[PDB]
Design a protein around this nucleic acid. Structure first.
Lengths: 322, 322, 322, 322
DNA sequence: TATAACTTCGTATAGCATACATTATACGAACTTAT
DNA sequence: ATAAGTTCGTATAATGTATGCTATACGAAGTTAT
DNA sequence: ATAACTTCGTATAGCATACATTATACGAACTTAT
DNA sequence: ATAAGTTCGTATAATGTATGCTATACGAAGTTAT
């Protein structure tokens, strides 16, 4: 019992070893799990298998997604494992009910959604519409969309880019150094190249904003209503704002969102990553190069990205209509 | 011993954690194992390494395929792991006997078999031989063969297709929404578009069957001896019947099978999937796109289907022939 | 003591789990180790770390290669580990001296040797020298050399080819099914494709030898002095004779070997393997394709194979001179 | 307790099991670790998880690179494992700080440096300034740079070349046999060929310095203030002097260093390796052949050198530019 | 004076890499139910 | 009598799932320099 | 006899995976024959 | 007095290594249908 309190202490002490998001979801799950326990006269820690099973079935009855429920169990599992205690998933009660929840839901029709693709055709169209704008916000959003499509970097990674991370090739193309991704933490890091055209877009943003006045300034910053950019070495442009750019750009071309309330009705943070991967698959780009561009080590993720390739223009329809 | 019983009751309580096909096979392997144990005066549960190795040598001598033998061991492993007992596979004896069996059967010449290919030329041939038939049966069978080849859906997936799952694209093609995906993250996508030709085959079947009288009706249904269709919203046409279609079509063209007992002498449920993969390969469709079309994540299942094609011969052939 | 005998008896009971060559070397090393123990008054089993150290230094003093010394230790390690005993390498005395011997020898000049390359130029020269021969032995040899270069198969793998393992692509090119290699054992196997040219060479051998009179016959067999082939479904052509073919072909072009006693003064069983890998590397074939050609799953052996690329016509000299 | 003392004496007896560079670093880390322990009132051996953690945080606060911190950790791991004691790394506390330290340092902008490239353009320039310099110092220095660039041998390897390692090729080029290879399986080969141009440079040095008066003499040696070389078969030019040649050459063209304390402000011992890799990449030489040229088996080292070249920009730039 | 263009936040959900186990078809035979 | 299925048990081919994270998705409420 | 092997025993290379050393950088303090 | 080294300690970049097999290398000695 002293081991448990000490094991948890060490995790909290070195809390920076984990992602801020991992912590944020840990607490979120704990609130949900603790509130349910209080209301059902159960002990929230350490978690008893039978209780966790009743709780996961409650989550299913609430109509939550399979990947949502897995997250709640996962966080429960981490809290226990890193305490030095057995996990709920170490028992049949919990591991079987999770298999059961996943099976029942998939059979009921559940499938994991995917972001609406932001592909080359969308990029060229947005560019032709926005490229002649002298508006500071338009010069920024166009430079952002360029980088997102060119590099397949997560919006959180783009937000972290600082001026000092930018270098050039012998041919004058921009190179962006990334030291940290979701799956890689290195001092060697990775280099993302930008095409001549995308480079030009970023160059225009740099001169109009004044970001290069301090090498520590983040490349992307907020632009206030009077069209003046406010560069900062301490404050990143939020992922929410970056998601907003994707959405505003979708609104610019296609109008308001459908009323369904579903996710992925407009472009979002993940859109350019999937769009670029699809364009690569379609152009016949070899797998090694696809993964080099996406920064992926395993080939299974390519199938994740291209799963929703348009079947009406798919290989089978085209072959049969011979 | 109370623990083992507790574990089995948990396994019973959450039956739905595993597919019914999994349960049917567990039972089957248990019957074979317990009958062999009974005969040879061995305890069947918990299973002992020495007895499992003698059983596996029996499976070999009997002439079962390596994959069949792995399946019996795998079913025994699961039962023991879920019971809380040591897995047969984790002992030295069983581990050594599997390596021996694998190596012996391979050197004896045992070959992994696969569905006889149902390709474009077969599909063309069948359409050409059967298009003049106005029989309900023949119209249905043609629509089934058309769907199977066009979509690469497996027989169970085709059997689950309901009328409400069907819509129309701006091009006038039929689109089949997948109501129950294979997995949570559906590598095959959420939709399957039909060609204009295959649309016409399904349309014809829809009008002669009357399945569109209720959108909850399954697309395919049984047709009795008087050419009268019996549409249903509750009862699917068995996957056995769908294999029957494939087999009966092969019988029409090539005649009756050998009384040998070999597998894959006529077409079967996976024939159109094998066939379509080969045709895309001939058409120069890239591996990732072929894989998305069938919903494959494992490239080696695909490679097995296309490995005897001239375009797959490798770099040494190209170097030598230039 | 009883545990150890049981563990050893079980390994021997399932001999077939290991290669014949693993057993041959286990027995070779044991004789050597046990003879040295007898003359030096040491107990041979279980081996004491100090005694094993002395033996390794003894092998060093004899001037044996590092990989020879490693094989001796390796077999000693296997015998102990599979007995359920700690390995000699589990102690500092043995593992440190092995590192030391390796390091001392490499500092003294030692490097692992590689087979002399049998490249495309070499193959074409032999082909245009021996094409015309109607001698049954020469037809066989040329077919062998073609397969060896085209497939990059080990000689033992080629010796194992049975007539039934041969099939055709629609274009008429030969396919060889191989179910077992040094790193792969599977009923699915792999298919090695031959060029139209190499296919013609094999066809000629099949026509001349009469091997196709029984599908179970090995493709390659001995040819006696009257130029008549002796097909067999039970007796292989020895890997020794296969090496002889490489040795005789080399002698035909460069005359009798030097009497220095050094290895790889002429072509041998591994030569077409390294030569083909170098031709692919020089022809700018992609890593994945090189690996597919040689049936390798990890990228590091590519570097092993091409380590001895001719420096004089290598990239740097060509870069500096033009 | 005495088992640990026996293990350490095994370590001393077979000290040649590790490089003397490994030894020098181990002592260095031990001194740092023991000095910190003595200052902070902690027992230095065995090392406790909590104490190791605090020491790592100290190294971080000191401003040491992540690799430097790993190096220190690795040494402590080695010392303990060989002692038969549990490793610091295998603890919760140490695993957690390493993740934390790596993430913090990367985010704080820490970058792994690499040698400033010495490329063909630099080599031609130096050659056009020192070609006719008749001074003995310059003839040697230019011969060294030539070999360094042509062979991609490391400084230590270049210092070990002796006269008897040199021979003539059929085409009039100097062929340098590698007397002592990097590893048992030498990825770089056993032979380095010099171009006709670099051959002239090396010949000039041989004739003007008198090293070929004894075949056992090292190729390179001291050249004192009076322009007289002092050939030696027992002592080599220090790798330190060879770095000085690179540094002095850089000062020749660009003057005194930026003096910002930073590394790689002038050329160093790895500069010609980096530079040759980049030049091969420009010329379109295959990755595998670039890797063979410098003995590389880890592609990621090569990539770090060439990833900021236009030819290595990736598929997305390629797709976006046409 | 409100207001663009954010930022912060909560719950809900997807993407990664690695390790390794179910899950679906195949098919002859035995039933079954409307002709 | 029988067409055309369904149900079933076992043989074997075909992919499947968990883990331990780390990330985006988006409506809602709050903030600051205009 | 003899071609053309086979058999055999010892010596040594190739493979896939999982993890640990081994080299260079460089300012400073010496050393040595001009 | 000094050019041009060498030695040294520590920072950091660069690859390196063991493991548990499975394979070939090749001289020699023995074999069998001509």
């Amino acid at each position: 019992s002293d081991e448990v309190r000490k094991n948890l202490m060490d995790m909290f002490r070195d809390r920076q070893a984990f992602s801020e998001h991992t912590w944020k979801m840990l607490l979120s799950v704990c609130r949900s799990w603790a509130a349910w326990c209080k209301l059902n006269n159960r002990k929230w820690f350490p978690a008893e298998p039978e209780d966790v099973r009743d709780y996961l079935l409650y989550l299913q009855a609430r109509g939550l997604a399979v990947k949502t429920i897995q997250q709640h169990l996962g966080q429960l599992n981490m809290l226990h494992r890193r305490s030095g205690l057995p996990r709920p998933s170490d028992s049949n009660a919990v591991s079987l009910v999770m298999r059961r929840i996943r099976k029942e839901n998939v059979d009921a029709g559940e499938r994991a959604k995917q972001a609406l693709a932001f592909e080359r055709t969308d990029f060229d169209q947005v560019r032709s519409l926005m490229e002649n704008s002298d508006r500071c916000q338009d010069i920024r959003n166009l430079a952002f969309l360029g980088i997102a499509y060119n590099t397949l970097l997560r919006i959180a990674e783009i937000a972290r880019i600082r001026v000092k991370d930018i270098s050039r090739t012998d041919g004058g193309r921009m190179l962006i150094h990334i030291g940290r991704t979701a799956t890689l933490v290195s001092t060697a890091g990775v280099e993302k190249a930008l095409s001549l055209g995308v480079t030009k877009l970023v160059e225009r943003w740099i001169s109009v904003s004044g970001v290069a006045d301090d090498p520590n300034n983040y490349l992307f910053c907020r632009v206030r209503k009077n069209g003046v950019a406010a560069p900062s070495a301490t404050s990143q442009l939020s992922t929410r704002a970056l998601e907003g750019i994707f959405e505003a750009t979708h609104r610019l071309i296609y109008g308001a969102k459908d009323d369904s309330g579903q996710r992925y009705l407009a472009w979002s943070g993940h859109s350019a990553r999937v769009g670029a991967a699809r364009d690569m698959a379609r152009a016949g780009v070899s797998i090694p190069e696809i993964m080099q561009a996406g920064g992926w080590t395993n080939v299974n993720i390519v199938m994740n990205y291209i799963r929703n390739l348009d079947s009406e223009t798919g290989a089978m329809v085209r072959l049969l209509e011979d």
